[PDB]
Structure formats: structure tokens, C-alpha cells
Design an enzyme around this catalytic site. Structure first.
Site, PDB file in Angstrom:
ATOM      1  N   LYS A 173     -32.915  17.565 -24.993  1.00 20.22           N
ATOM      2  CA  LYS A 173     -33.368  17.548 -23.609  1.00 20.22           C
ATOM      3  C   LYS A 173     -34.082  16.234 -23.321  1.00 20.22           C
ATOM      4  O   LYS A 173     -34.788  15.700 -24.180  1.00 20.22           O
ATOM      5  CB  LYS A 173     -34.302  18.730 -23.341  1.00 20.22           C
ATOM      6  CG  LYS A 173     -34.656  18.958 -21.878  1.00 20.22           C
ATOM      7  CD  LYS A 173     -35.325  20.309 -21.684  1.00 20.22           C
ATOM      8  CE  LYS A 173     -35.902  20.446 -20.284  1.00 20.22           C
ATOM      9  NZ  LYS A 173     -36.666  21.714 -20.123  1.00 20.22           N
ATOM     10  N   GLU A 180     -31.420  15.439 -18.399  1.00 16.29           N
ATOM     11  CA  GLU A 180     -30.203  16.141 -18.773  1.00 16.29           C
ATOM     12  C   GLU A 180     -30.252  16.651 -20.210  1.00 16.29           C
ATOM     13  O   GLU A 180     -30.668  15.935 -21.125  1.00 16.29           O
ATOM     14  CB  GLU A 180     -28.969  15.255 -18.546  1.00 16.29           C
ATOM     15  CG  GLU A 180     -28.976  13.924 -19.301  1.00 16.29           C
ATOM     16  CD  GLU A 180     -27.837  13.004 -18.897  1.00 16.29           C
ATOM     17  OE1 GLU A 180     -26.720  13.496 -18.630  1.00 16.29           O
ATOM     18  OE2 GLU A 180     -28.061  11.775 -18.848  1.00 16.29           O
ATOM     19  N   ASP A 201     -36.303  26.670 -21.827  1.00 17.78           N
ATOM     20  CA  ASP A 201     -37.059  26.204 -20.651  1.00 17.78           C
ATOM     21  C   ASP A 201     -38.320  27.026 -20.371  1.00 17.78           C
ATOM     22  O   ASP A 201     -38.273  28.052 -19.681  1.00 17.78           O
ATOM     23  CB  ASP A 201     -36.171  26.165 -19.397  1.00 17.78           C
ATOM     24  CG  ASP A 201     -35.354  24.890 -19.292  1.00 17.78           C
ATOM     25  OD1 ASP A 201     -34.455  24.677 -20.135  1.00 17.78           O
ATOM     26  OD2 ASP A 201     -35.601  24.106 -18.351  1.00 17.78           O
ATOM     27  N   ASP A 255     -41.044  32.245 -14.842  1.00 18.77           N
ATOM     28  CA  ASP A 255     -39.727  31.761 -14.406  1.00 18.77           C
ATOM     29  C   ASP A 255     -38.573  32.348 -15.229  1.00 18.77           C
ATOM     30  O   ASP A 255     -37.729  31.618 -15.761  1.00 18.77           O
ATOM     31  CB  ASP A 255     -39.695  30.224 -14.419  1.00 18.77           C
ATOM     32  CG  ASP A 255     -38.469  29.646 -13.721  1.00 18.77           C
ATOM     33  OD1 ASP A 255     -38.050  28.531 -14.099  1.00 18.77           O
ATOM     34  OD2 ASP A 255     -37.924  30.295 -12.801  1.00 18.77           O
ATOM     35  N   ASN A 303     -32.005  30.323 -17.969  1.00 17.69           N
ATOM     36  CA  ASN A 303     -32.774  30.051 -19.181  1.00 17.69           C
ATOM     37  C   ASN A 303     -32.488  31.025 -20.318  1.00 17.69           C
ATOM     38  O   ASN A 303     -32.981  30.852 -21.436  1.00 17.69           O
ATOM     39  CB  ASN A 303     -34.268  30.026 -18.861  1.00 17.69           C
ATOM     40  CG  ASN A 303     -34.612  29.014 -17.787  1.00 17.69           C
ATOM     41  OD1 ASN A 303     -34.065  27.910 -17.755  1.00 17.69           O
ATOM     42  ND2 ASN A 303     -35.523  29.388 -16.896  1.00 17.69           N
ATOM     43  N   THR A 318     -36.209  28.095  -6.019  1.00 16.73           N
ATOM     44  CA  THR A 318     -35.306  29.247  -6.158  1.00 16.73           C
ATOM     45  C   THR A 318     -36.080  30.542  -6.451  1.00 16.73           C
ATOM     46  O   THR A 318     -36.146  30.986  -7.603  1.00 16.73           O
ATOM     47  CB  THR A 318     -34.205  29.008  -7.228  1.00 16.73           C
ATOM     48  OG1 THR A 318     -34.810  28.814  -8.514  1.00 16.73           O
ATOM     49  CG2 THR A 318     -33.362  27.787  -6.876  1.00 16.73           C
ATOM     50  N   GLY A 352     -26.061  20.138 -19.460  1.00 10.31           N
ATOM     51  CA  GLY A 352     -27.105  20.631 -18.568  1.00 10.31           C
ATOM     52  C   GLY A 352     -27.811  19.447 -17.952  1.00 10.31           C
ATOM     53  O   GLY A 352     -28.036  18.443 -18.625  1.00 10.31           O
ATOM     54  N   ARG A 353     -28.144  19.551 -16.671  1.00 12.58           N
ATOM     55  CA  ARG A 353     -28.807  18.465 -15.960  1.00 12.58           C
ATOM     56  C   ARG A 353     -29.721  19.017 -14.873  1.00 12.58           C
ATOM     57  O   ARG A 353     -29.833  20.233 -14.696  1.00 12.58           O
ATOM     58  CB  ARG A 353     -27.769  17.490 -15.380  1.00 12.58           C
ATOM     59  CG  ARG A 353     -28.326  16.401 -14.453  1.00 12.58           C
ATOM     60  CD  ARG A 353     -27.544  15.108 -14.560  1.00 12.58           C
ATOM     61  NE  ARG A 353     -26.114  15.354 -14.714  1.00 12.58           N
ATOM     62  CZ  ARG A 353     -25.291  14.579 -15.411  1.00 12.58           C
ATOM     63  NH1 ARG A 353     -25.743  13.496 -16.032  1.00 12.58           N
ATOM     64  NH2 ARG A 353     -24.008  14.893 -15.497  1.00 12.58           N
ATOM     65  N   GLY A 354     -30.378  18.111 -14.159  1.00 14.50           N
ATOM     66  CA  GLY A 354     -31.248  18.464 -13.053  1.00 14.50           C
ATOM     67  C   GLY A 354     -32.675  18.096 -13.379  1.00 14.50           C
ATOM     68  O   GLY A 354     -32.936  17.019 -13.927  1.00 14.50           O
ATOM     69  N   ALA A 355     -33.587  19.008 -13.043  1.00 12.18           N
ATOM     70  CA  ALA A 355     -35.023  18.855 -13.287  1.00 12.18           C
ATOM     71  C   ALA A 355     -35.465  17.395 -13.387  1.00 12.18           C
ATOM     72  O   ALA A 355     -35.406  16.653 -12.401  1.00 12.18           O
ATOM     73  CB  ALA A 355     -35.441  19.647 -14.529  1.00 12.18           C
ATOM     74  N   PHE A 356     -35.896  16.992 -14.580  1.00 13.71           N
ATOM     75  CA  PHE A 356     -36.346  15.629 -14.819  1.00 13.71           C
ATOM     76  C   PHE A 356     -35.443  14.911 -15.815  1.00 13.71           C
ATOM     77  O   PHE A 356     -35.719  13.779 -16.212  1.00 13.71           O
ATOM     78  CB  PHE A 356     -37.799  15.629 -15.299  1.00 13.71           C
ATOM     79  CG  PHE A 356     -38.762  16.205 -14.301  1.00 13.71           C
ATOM     80  CD1 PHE A 356     -39.246  15.427 -13.256  1.00 13.71           C
ATOM     81  CD2 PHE A 356     -39.181  17.528 -14.401  1.00 13.71           C
ATOM     82  CE1 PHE A 356     -40.135  15.952 -12.327  1.00 13.71           C
ATOM     83  CE2 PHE A 356     -40.072  18.065 -13.474  1.00 13.71           C
ATOM     84  CZ  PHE A 356     -40.548  17.274 -12.434  1.00 13.71           C
ATOM     85  N   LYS A 413     -35.163  33.815 -15.673  1.00 10.92           N
ATOM     86  CA  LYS A 413     -33.887  33.793 -14.957  1.00 10.92           C
ATOM     87  C   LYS A 413     -32.703  33.573 -15.905  1.00 10.92           C
ATOM     88  O   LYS A 413     -32.880  33.018 -16.992  1.00 10.92           O
ATOM     89  CB  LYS A 413     -33.900  32.750 -13.826  1.00 10.92           C
ATOM     90  CG  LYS A 413     -34.270  31.330 -14.229  1.00 10.92           C
ATOM     91  CD  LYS A 413     -34.401  30.452 -12.992  1.00 10.92           C
ATOM     92  CE  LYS A 413     -34.761  29.021 -13.357  1.00 10.92           C
ATOM     93  NZ  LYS A 413     -34.955  28.172 -12.147  1.00 10.92           N
TER      94      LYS A 413
HETATM   95  O1  LIG Z   1     -27.969  23.173 -21.344  1.00 11.47           O
HETATM   96  S1  LIG Z   1     -29.166  23.885 -20.986  1.00 11.47           S
HETATM   97  O2  LIG Z   1     -29.877  23.081 -20.028  1.00 11.47           O
HETATM   98  C1  LIG Z   1     -30.084  24.115 -22.287  1.00 11.47           C
HETATM   99  C2  LIG Z   1     -31.477  24.073 -22.164  1.00 11.47           C
HETATM  100  C3  LIG Z   1     -32.326  24.271 -23.257  1.00 11.47           C
HETATM  101  C4  LIG Z   1     -31.841  24.526 -24.542  1.00 11.47           C
HETATM  102  C5  LIG Z   1     -30.470  24.585 -24.779  1.00 11.47           C
HETATM  103  C6  LIG Z   1     -29.961  24.839 -26.049  1.00 11.47           C
HETATM  104  N1  LIG Z   1     -28.629  24.893 -26.242  1.00 11.47           N
HETATM  105  C7  LIG Z   1     -27.743  24.712 -25.243  1.00 11.47           C
HETATM  106  C8  LIG Z   1     -28.154  24.455 -23.933  1.00 11.47           C
HETATM  107  C9  LIG Z   1     -29.518  24.382 -23.650  1.00 11.47           C
HETATM  108  N2  LIG Z   1     -28.827  25.237 -20.348  1.00 11.47           N
HETATM  109  C10 LIG Z   1     -27.447  25.729 -20.296  1.00 11.47           C
HETATM  110  C11 LIG Z   1     -26.737  25.209 -19.036  1.00 11.47           C
HETATM  111  C12 LIG Z   1     -27.596  25.107 -17.768  1.00 11.47           C
HETATM  112  N3  LIG Z   1     -28.642  26.112 -17.674  1.00 11.47           N
HETATM  113  C13 LIG Z   1     -29.932  25.858 -18.291  1.00 11.47           C
HETATM  114  C14 LIG Z   1     -29.898  26.074 -19.804  1.00 11.47           C
END
Ligand SMILES: O=S(=O)(c1cccc2cnccc12)N1CCCNCC1
Ligand SMILES: O=S(=O)(c1cccc2cnccc12)N1CCCNCC1
Lengths: 400, 398
Positions: free
Chosen positions: B101, B85, B212, B194, B199, B233, B79-83, B196
Site C-alpha cells: 500500500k 494505490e 484498511d 468503517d 475492506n 460513503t 487497488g487505488r484511491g484514498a492517498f 464495509k
Molecule cells: O487491493 S486492496 O486495496 C487491498 C487493501 C489492503 C490489503 C490488501 C491485501 N491483499 C490484497 C488487496 C488488498 N483491496 C481490494 C480491492 C479494492 N478494495 C479495497 C481492498
């Protein structure tokens, strides 16, 4: 190891001597907020944000931590540069103390030492009946506070001004001083400022040393390297006095010299190097070999004159250069009232008779009040004046 | 309060995790005050040159002892983006797998938004709800905030929807879990703002959890939350939150329920009800929801589904959930013979992930390379204090 780490870190947070214990951390934070909360600085977001984030928090802390208004000032009992000492009663515990206030500003206003660390350390950890005991050390943005034990018997300066000290007495005190200094030397310090002002008597009339602002850790050779002389005109030793940039390297003998001066004064009523002006005392001290004369008074025992002279002489031949034991074995101390190892258990020559836990009869009067003295100037940019006084607090992580 | 009381209230404050003055927090303040001061320009001041020279030895050892980044072996970015990865990490010592995170201290500082993370840290660390992703460790350095959370191997709901034409039974299950999750977040006194599919994460059992929370806020006395913040978004964002561009707006928790409505529509339709080619496009269609909200002429979507979707996708004042979550739960769409609300997270999920190892990331798309050279802070000539916004973030569990 993940364990070893969590543990070591836990120790650094607990240890009463760790530079990052609760006392140091609470101080560090307290210092920050103090040194940021200025309109000129608040203009910066971070600072303003941070302070508003901790406004409620920091306030609760300052209300829970030990503060000045936790004490009821019974009476001032001593003053000096950098601050005063006051007989206080802890409003909550009702317990009576002698609290020492130190002007953060004044010390910063040219004091070139950070002396208070030694004094805090010694009085808090010495654990010697010869050392005044520090119970609490706390601070604020303006003063350092040292909550010590109250010595109701007063100092030796007061005692000497009220009595023509007989030899018996002189012996007793000289003896308690010698033992007191030996105890300080044992902690690895040269006192450098042994004088009647710092010699206090407890409720039983027994001696303790107070004010260690001049103490300095001895090196492995048991010596001290100092380019600038410290101490008091009448009591400073010929070597600490002459101490120059050329070297300035002396041993603990400098203290014993002072003990000699102390003895001479009790018996004679005058200092061995009195002069019209301070500078005269200076010349007379360097010329101790010729200036050391006793008045025509048939009452100073042979031994007394001997010890005084054995002390008031050039370091190289001065009694005490060969450990404390050679002082103790001096004839002047030979008596049939006490033995060294049990001295502080014998009855004192002057036992104070106290009316109340706050009896200050053995301390000269003093004004009180004054009117809140000037402190640091309101910063225009981050100065961080509270940073040098971080970890001074002795409250959250004290030794038991 | 007695001296004993006062002394102990203070000594306990040093040990309370929910405390801003806990030992970890305080240790930050010092760790930070070293960074935002150890600059040649600032060393000029003696109180600084001395303070630093005193804590040099100590502060370094500290940073090395405390939880640091190199305590984790990065298995793979997920997962990436925001501030920053989100990366799959295995703790080098404990050999435990976590989803870590990252949040560029500089990146936050740069574009304001250096306060959202407090809510997220707090919720994930203390929620103690199966509907919330759990935060085990929160540590930092001079450049990144770190949030060691529990890994959700089942992936997010965005991924799920891209692999399946979600049937109603499924849609109902997830909608139900979301409703329960949000309600739990509301119970802690937060409006999510938020909600969606991104999350919405699935655990090893295929059960939903919210991750998130960097948009949640505390509800005032009457249960509202004013705000002024740009919107990214808007697809799931409610009409109220949108019409609240500038603080000129207080909205209730029903803004979350609207999002749930958007969520349900997407699962059943395959697209967001107010999707448009441009952001302003979506926003417009959202505002004009009384007219823009349509369903396709394939009556695959059931009566109840159309009802609930509409019950959510309506003006706050009449929106389902303005009278508590109970009126949502009582909607017919949820009426089934597979589960009951109070035991839902104990029933078997519609999609249970089959995992090969503790580091199986099959349910997460491969991510690109950042190639980014994350800009660094410039050497200050005075006191900037770019650490003060991140002081008290460090958090450890027992
Ligand atoms: O990898 S995460 O950023 C992620 C965020 C927060 C907690 C997490 C816990 N486990 C896996 C991925 C997690 N995510 C999945 C892929 C992209 N969409 C956003 C949520
Ligand atoms: O007030 S004191 O400074 C003082 C210092 C340290 C500890 C004390 C304990 N009790 C009384 C006075 C104390 N002091 C009294 C008279 C002035 N001479 C110096 C000794």
C-alpha cells in the site's frame, strides 16, 4: 544482498564510532525536540503535532539516559572559559569522577574550533595510562558533560608551587611527559598545548595528560597545516607562534619544545621566557637563541642545561626531530632508579596521601555555585543549536 | 532503578518494535531532519549547513541500505484511491509476494488526515489475529508511506457480491466471520467505524480478513471514542457516528454492529438498505432508518435474517451487541449445522478461490491508469517539517 544490508545497517547502529549509533540517534531526536519546543515554533502544526506525539516518549528517554542530576557535585576543582570541572560522585553507583561541563552557548559564542570532538575521542579511545580516561559523555540543551577519571594527585603547576623541584623529580616527570606525548603522537596527534596545568597525577603520583582541546590530526607527511597559532604564551614553540597564513606547516617538534620549557621551569622555578607582559614573552621566545639564559645557580646539572637547550632551539636542529628515541637516549635521563619501558611501574617522587575517595587537598580551593549562567536565547525561528552537538553522547555505544 | 536497570531499559527500548524510540524510528528522525532542512534557504544557518554536511555521506548510504521502494517489483496495481494505490509486489531479493500500500505524504499533508495511518500500522503489525490482514514491512521515503501487507488472493466481498446472488448460508458464514473479526478488533481496544465489504478480504482459503483500519480509534476508560471527522460513503456508517459530526458525540462499539447489519442486508438484498443517488440522500435515509428500512415483497429472506438485520439496524441503546458480542452470536440467524463459532475459520469456506500462480489477480478488477502527476512539496523558505508527521512509521519484522 538483503542479508549483507540488514547487517551493515546493524553495524552502523552498534559501532562506538558510527555517526549514526544509538548515542547519535537518541541525541539526534533529543536535539530535535529541544530545538522545536518553543511557543513561537509550536504555531506550526507539524512541529506542535510531532512534539505532542513525542512528549511522553522524549521525557521517558531523558529520565532513562544519563543526566546531570545523576551526579552529586562534591566540589569544583577547576574552571575555564567554556566551563568548569567538578569532583562528582554518581548518586547511584557511588563512584567518584571528575566531570567536565562545557557551555554549549559559550563554545557557540565564538570558539571557531569544535575542539571538544578531539578531546572526547582521545580520552574515550586512547586507552593509554598516559591519557585521562573518559567514561561517559552526555549532554542536555545547555552543557556538554565529560565524565572522566579523577586525578587526586593534582596538576604539576600545584606540585611546582609547593616544592623546589630537585633534578631527580624533574627527570621523572619530564620522562613521563615524554612518554605521554609519544603515546599521543602515536595516535597521530600533535598536542600543541603541553603545559603543567594539563599534567595530572593519579592516586599513585604518576602523570597523565588531560585537556586535549588543541590536539589536531597529523597528515601523511606527519605535519599540520594551521594559519592561526594555538597553545600557551610561555610554552608555544617559535614555529607554532610564527605560524601564519603564508603557510603555517609544522611537525610534532612543537610539543618537544614545550617539554623543554616544562623542564626549564621545574629546575629554575621560572619560565625560560618570563616577561613583564605576555607580549614580552613573545619577543623573548622568537629571540630564544639569545634570550635563553640560566640564572647563576650551581645546581642545574650539565645534562639538564643540555636537554633544555636541545629542546629550546629552532625546529630544524631541535632534539626530537628524529623520533622520540633520540630524546630518550639523552644523558639527562641516564639514571639508576628506572628504565623507560618500566617507568610508570617505578615508585613516584611524590606519592599523594589521601584521606578519602573525595580528597581534594591537592587542588586549590574554588567558590562553587556561581548561579546558572546565561545560555542560548529563546528562538523565534528554527535555529537548531543542538545539531552541532549531536552524537557527542558516549553512553549507549561505548567501547569495552 | 539501578544504573544497570536504567541503562538496559533504555538499551531495550532501542530494540522494541512497539517502541517509538526503537532504532528504526530514531533513524527516521534523522533521515527526516535531513530532508526538511536540506534547502538552500535553510543552509544559511551554520548549525544546519554543518549538520547536513556531516550527515550527507552517512544519511545517503543509510537510505540506500534500508528497505526502499525499488526493492520491490510491481506485479500489477490491484487497488487505488484514498492517498495511494495498493499494488501487487514481489520482493526482488526474497522473491516473496506482498500487497503493498502507498500513501502520498503530500496528499495526506494537503488534506489534513496525516494520523489515521498510525492505527492501521499498529493494528496490522501487532494484532497477530487471523481476522486481521498482516503488516510485514512499513518503510518510507520523502514522498510515500509504504505498507507491505499479506496479499489476499480471494479478492474483496464487494467483488464476491457482484458475481453471486449471495445465498443465506453464505451470508451467514461471512456475517459470522465479520462478527468474529470485529470482536477481535474490539478486543485490541478499537472501534472500527468503517466496516464495509471493500475492506473485507478473502485469503487463499476463502476466509475473511479485515484490511484498511485508518478509521479505528482507542476506546477511553468507559469504552467510548469521541470524534469529529467528515464522512465518506455513509452507506455502512451508523446513526451515532453520523450524528457525531463535530466531536459533539461519544459512541460505543455498537456502531460497528450496525455496519454488520448493513452488510447482511446487502448480501441478501443486493443493495444497501439506505442507498440513495446522493450522499446526503443516503445519510437522510440512514437517520430516518425507523421508516426507510424496508424489505422486498419476495420473502426469500428468512425470518431470522429479517430479525438480525433489524436487531442491528436500530438505535444504539436497543441495538444487538450493546451487551457484548455473545448476544449476537446467540441469535437464531447463525443457528446452523455446518459450523460453530470457535471453529468457524477452520471450516471450509463457501467460495474457495482457484489460483493459477502466486500472482493470480483474477479476483481483482483491472484498474485504470492514474495519469496523475502527484503534486510535490514547494521549496520552504523556513522550517515546515513535512516529515515530522511520518517519523516513527518505519517498521521491520523478524
Ligand atoms: O487491493 S486492496 O486495496 C487491498 C487493501 C489492503 C490489503 C490488501 C491485501 N491483499 C490484497 C488487496 C488488498 N483491496 C481490494 C480491492 C479494492 N478494495 C479495497 C481492498
Ligand atoms: O580540574 S582540571 O581542569 C581537570 C581536568 C581534567 C581531568 C581532571 C581529573 N581530575 C582532576 C582534575 C581534572 N585540572 C585541575 C586544576 C586546574 N588545572 C587543570 C587540571
Amino acid at each position: 544482498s538483503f542479508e549483507t544490508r540488514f547487517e551493515k545497517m546493524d553495524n552502523l547502529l552498534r559501532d562506538p564510532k558510527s555517526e549514526v549509533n544509538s548515542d547519535c540517534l537518541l541525541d539526534g531526536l533529543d536535539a530535535l525536540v529541544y530545538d522545536l519546543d518553543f511557543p513561537a515554533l509550536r504555531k506550526n502544526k507539524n512541529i506542535d503535532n510531532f512534539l505532542s506525539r513525542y512528549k511522553d516518549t522524549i521525557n521517558k528517554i531523558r529520565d532513562l539516559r544519563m543526566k546531570a542530576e545523576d551526579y552529586e557535585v562534591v566540589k569544583v576543582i577547576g574552571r575555564g572559559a567554556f566551563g568548569e570541572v567538578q569532583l562528582v560522585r554518581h548518586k547511584s553507583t557511588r563512584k567518584v569522577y571528575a566531570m567536565k561541563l562545557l557551555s554549549k552557548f559559550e563554545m557557540i559564542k565564538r570558539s571557531d574550533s569544535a575542539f571538544f570532538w578531539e578531546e572526547r575521542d582521545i580520552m574515550a579511545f586512547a586507552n593509554s595510562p598516559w591519557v585521562v580516561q573518559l567514561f561517559y559523555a552526555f549532554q542536555d540543551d545547555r552543557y556538554l558533560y565529560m565524565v572522566m577519571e579523577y586525578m587526586p594527585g593534582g596538576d604539576l603547576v600545584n606540585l611546582m608551587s609547593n616544592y623546589d623541584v630537585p633534578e631527580k623529580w624533574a627527570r621523572f616527570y619530564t620522562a613521563e611527559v615524554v612518554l605521554a606525548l609519544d603515546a599521543i603522537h602515536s595516535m597521530g596527534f600533535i598536542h600543541r598545548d603541553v603545559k603543567p596545568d594539563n599534567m595530572l597525577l593519579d592516586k599513585s603520583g604518576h602523570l597523565k595528560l588531560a585537556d586535549f582541546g588543541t590536539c589536531m590530526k597529523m597528515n601523511k607527511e606527519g605535519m599540520v597545516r594551521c594559519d592561526t597559532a594555538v597553545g600557551t604564551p610561555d610554552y608555544i614553540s617559535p614555529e607554532v607562534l610564527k605560524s601564519q597564513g603564508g603557510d603555517g606547516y609544522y611537525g610534532r617538534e612543537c610539543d618537544w619544545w614545550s617539554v623543554g620549557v616544562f623542564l626549564y621551569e621545574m629546575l629554575v622555578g621560572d619560565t625560560p621566557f618570563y616577561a613583564d607582559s605576555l607580549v614580552g614573552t613573545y619577543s623573548k621566545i622568537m629571540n630564544h637563541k639569545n634570550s635563553l639564559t640560566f640564572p647563576d645557580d650551581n645546581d642545574i646539572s650539565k645534562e639538564a642545561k643540555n636537554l633544555i637547550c636541545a629542546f629550546l632551539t629552532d625546529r630544524e636542529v631541535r632534539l626530537g626531530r628524529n623520533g622520540v628515541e633520540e630524546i630518550k637516549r639523552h644523558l639527562f635521563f641516564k639514571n639508576d632508579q628506572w628504565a623507560w619501558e618500566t617507568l610508570r611501574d617505578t615508585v613516584a617522587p611524590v606519592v599523594p596521601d589521601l584521606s578519602s575517595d573525595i580528597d581534594t587537598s591537592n587542588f586549590d580551593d574554588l567558590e562553587e555555585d556561581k548561579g546558572e549562567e546565561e545560555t542560548f536565547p529563546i528562538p523565534k525561528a528554527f535555529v537548531g543549536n543542538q545539531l552541532p552537538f549531536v552524537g557527542f553522547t558516549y553512553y549507549s555505544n561505548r567501547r569495552y
